[model samples]
Target: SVYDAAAQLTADVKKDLRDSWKVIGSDKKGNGVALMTTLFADNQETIGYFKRLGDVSQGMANDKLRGVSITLMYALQNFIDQLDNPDDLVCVVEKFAVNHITRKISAAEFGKMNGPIKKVLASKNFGDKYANAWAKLVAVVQAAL
Candidate 1:
């Protein structure tokens, strides 16, 4: 049931996720760019994937990258923080889906995102549990998109 899935995100997990983000938060741009850079490096074909973002691997203005990084982090964080509230979860995911529907982002591109996300989390010393937690969150985000 939806409730069961929501309940999977315990307070312990939320704290871990929050603390983990804090460490990475210090270098959001660098970390964000690193994630984007890895994505493009691993799959050069995805260079111009997002219409709004082009070749982020090459380089992006600091402000631009920082904005993108924080926005992305906050979205994920909101979803994680609201896991116990299914209504809120749907609201966040619904808005996300609507926002990207016009862009027509595909699931394949989202699947591509998971790899670098896991890589970055692992690099940040997050264990398998956190990686799996992020994987599930990414799955939810992908479903929304």
Candidate 2:
């Protein structure tokens, strides 16, 4: 459900995070390692990638049925964070794209991931196919990378 996962994340959420936090948080203290600055802007591509991803995943939560799409967004952001630069981001994104577009990830991982997070669907609020949503999310992110 787009509504479910669209609350916190957007296409520009990372800027907000970067602006708000002086530190990268405990989870990302090691984030500074990629800054091999030279003539080029260090981590520029990475910064761009994260910029897009943060927008896609503003308010991510695992235990809520409202964030399957957001979860996929979060997952992509994670992938971007792993990149050393644009080239690396491209390679990793290709892998993600192949799996997502080809449905190699079974497109079933989402419901599995969300099962424990939300209350029992209730009536059919659109989250019935979170797997597909994840697939699309991965596909978009792969392109961005």
Q: In candidate 1, which residue ranges exceed 4 Å CA deviation?
A: 1-16, 51-55, 60-66
Per-candidate TM-score against the hidden true structure: 0.75, 0.26
Error of 1 at 64 (Å): 3.8
Point to the candidate with the largest TM-score: 1
lDDT tens digits by residue: candidate 2, 1-145: 3222323233344333332222322222122211111101322332332333343222232123223333443444654364334445455655655655564333433223233212122122324343243333333443332
Deviation in angstroms for 109 in model 2? 18
The lDDT per prediction is: 0.68, 0.34
Candidate 2 residue spans exceeding 4 A from truth: 1-74, 80-84, 104-145
Number of backbone clashes in candidate 1 = 0
